[PDB]
Amino acid sequence: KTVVVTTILESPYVMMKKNHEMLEGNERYEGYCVDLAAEIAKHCGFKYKLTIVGDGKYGARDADTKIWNGMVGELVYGKADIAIAPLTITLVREEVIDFSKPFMSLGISIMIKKGTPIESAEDLSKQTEIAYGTLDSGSTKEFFRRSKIAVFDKMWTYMRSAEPSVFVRTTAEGVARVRKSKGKYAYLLESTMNEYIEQRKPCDTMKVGGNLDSKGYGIATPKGSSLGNAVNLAVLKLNEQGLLDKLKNKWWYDKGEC
Amino acid sequence: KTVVVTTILESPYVMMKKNHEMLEGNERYEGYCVDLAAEIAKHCGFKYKLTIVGDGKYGARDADTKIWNGMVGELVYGKADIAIAPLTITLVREEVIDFSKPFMSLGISIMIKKGTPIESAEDLSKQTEIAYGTLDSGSTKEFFRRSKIAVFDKMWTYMRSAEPSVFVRTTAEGVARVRKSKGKYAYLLESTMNEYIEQRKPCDTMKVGGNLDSKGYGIATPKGSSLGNAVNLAVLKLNEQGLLDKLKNKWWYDKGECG
Ligand SMILES: O=C(O)C[C@@]12O[C@H]3C=CCN[C@H]3[C@@H]1C(=O)N[C@H]2C(=O)O
Ligand SMILES: [Cl-]
Ligand SMILES: [Cl-]
Ligand SMILES: [Cl-]
Ligand SMILES: [Cl-]
């Protein structure tokens, strides 16, 4: 009867509080998705325990074994009752679990080190002097790889052919690369992460240009889960009570340095 | 067995081609939702008729009679199999129909006549010289009535007590009112519509400020519909192929009359 919530350690969505070793259970964690979890539970009348996804992954099906990892795997294989994380709503996932309507929208955007003479994807496309790239594996890369749009296609062919490599293994590396490259590298990533980092010391980065695309984060439950309907309704209510906006403002701006 | 699609005549989602009495059936109509409808049927493998909703409303429940009007009413009362329209996904509607994930996202924004000295809701709230309003009902009005935000609250109180009325009955009314009030009126409306009108002649309007909130339009089916799963999957596939983006670009920008 205690609901098992699975999530993932990703700031500012879910973080381990500074004195977590002095804290018990759910109080070890803070962040946007921790509050969201609490808000969901209140409007759904259930008790819950926060767990961190065992393998540190989101949810991907291995082409060969067909096994799901991450949070999606924890739902499908019955370790968790529900996922409350920055888990993107995608077709392959929707086919094996239920999604709430998205609690947050986002898109591909450009992170620059402040000073950089770039204001848009187009700016990036027309030049090579400032290197730019994405995570070496994931949707942003595939977006570029698959786009039929001129600008985005010129960016991809550029990125694929660039030497040395413009791809990074981790988000943290991308951001470092920006910060360390003295304004000669730009990074493509979730507008949400871009916005968050903009509010981080040493305050030396900046989101520019519009979003290139659009996707959504949703709460995830097993197909036919008794929780999903209430959970989805709770998402919509929260949005209409200004609460999701308030949460975002909280973790991004009110608690922002810079 | 042909799927009955309810939808609504709202530009540029669905539009009766001016020569429509020479045309017939689905081909009488064009626009973003007509294309969207076709993509969905193709991916869901079905055949459909487009039918404009008898009352021209989106979907709201009468406070008294408890009766659902509009496209929601058509789905809830079993008069249509699916609604493919700029139908905002909302709690009360979600409780009575099935929605797909959003095929398009939007938020409340500010339409001004070019040259109007207003850049934000904050700006609007801090003055009265320029009047500003919303549709006399719906998602946008409700947002202001309910807001706990100081700026939005002040705007609601102003709007509610403003004379003459700052509320308009229809989008066209609100657009015309902005267009003719010599920059003495700004309309608060869906960013999607704001963005479309921006690309229409006389090209005398402008969207300004950030969105005030976030919402999505979804495709609705009657609760429990066998169609709901497949359709929702299609929205995601279309979105991942970049197809939804291609369409919005098509009807908003490719076809823009303002350069
Ligand atoms: O990057 C991906 O392909 C997926 C995502 O992986 C994250 C990790 C690094 C950069 N991107 C984000 C993306 C996000 O916002 N949610 C994840 C997810 O939805 O699994
Ligand atoms: Cl965003
Ligand atoms: Cl990462
Ligand atoms: Cl928008
Ligand atoms: Cl109302």
Whole-angstrom distance, CA of residue A215 vs CA of residue B102: 10
- B205 has binding-site annotation: no
Q: What is the DSSP string of B20-37?
A: TTTS-GGGGEESHHHHHH
How many Cα neighbours within 13 Å face the side chain of B61? 13
Nearest 5°: phi and psi at B119?
-120, -15
Tell how far CA A140 is from the center of its chain: 11
Task: In chain A, list all ranges with CATH 3.40.190.10.
Answer: 1-106+216-255, 107-215
- Statement: A1-106+216-255 belongs to CATH 3.40.190.10: yes
Resolution for the entry shown, Å: 2.3
Q: How was this structure determined?
A: X-ray
Q: What's the CATH number for B107-215?
A: 3.40.190.10
B101/A216 Cβ within 8 A: yes
Nearest protein Cα to ligand 1, atom 10: A171
Q: Give all strands (DSSP E) within B42-184, no chain letters.
A: 48-52, 82-83, 97-99, 104-106, 108-113, 131-133
Task: Name residues with Cβ closer than 5 Å to ligand 5, which is an ion.
Answer: B 137, 141
What is the 3-class SS of chain A, one letter each residue?
A: CEEEEEECCECCCEEECCCHHHCCHHHHEECHHHHHHHHHHHCCCCEEEEEECCCCCCCCECCCCCCECHHHHHHHCCCCCEECCCCECCHHHHCCEEECCCCEEECEEEEEECCCCCCCHHHHHCCCCCEEECECCCHHHHHHHHCCCHHHHHHHHHHHHCCCCCCECCHHHHHHHHHHCCCCEEEEEEHHHHHHHHCCCCCCEEEECCCCCCEEECCEEECCCCCHHHHHHHHHHHHHCCHHHHHHHHHHHHCCCC
Cis peptide before B202 (omega within 30 of 0): yes
Q: Residue B188 in contact with residue B133, Cβ under 8 Å? A: yes
The interaxial angle of helices B32-44 and B227-240, nearest 10 deg, is: 110
Residue numbers preceding breaks in chain B (C to N > 2.5 A): none
Whole-angstrom distance, CA of residue A49 vs CA of residue A101: 23
Helix (H, G, I), strand (E, B) or coil at B157: helix
- Scanning every residue of chain A, which has its alpha carbon at the shortest distance from the alpha carbon of B233? A91
What is the 3-class SS of B191-253, one letter each residue?
A: HHHHHHHCCCCCCCEEEECCCCCCEEECCEEECCCCHHHHHHHHHHHHHHCCHHHHHHHHHHH
Cβ of residue B99 closer than 8 Å to a chain A Cβ: yes
- A61 has binding-site annotation: no
CA nearest A85: which of A45, A57, A123?
A57
**In this structure, what token pair is assigned to residue B256?**
């823009």
- Beta strand A205-208 with A108-113 is antiparallel
Shortest distance between the Cα of A101 and any Cα of chain B, in A, equals: 6
State in Å: Cα A111 to ligand 5 middle.
Answer: 41
List, in order, residues 6 or more apart from A137 with CB less than 8 Å away. none
Question: A-contacting residues of B 12-71, CB under 8 Å?
Answer: none
- B128 has binding-site annotation: no
List, in order, residues 6 or more apart from A142 with CB less than 8 Å away. none
Cβ of residue B153 closer than 8 Å to a chain A Cβ: no
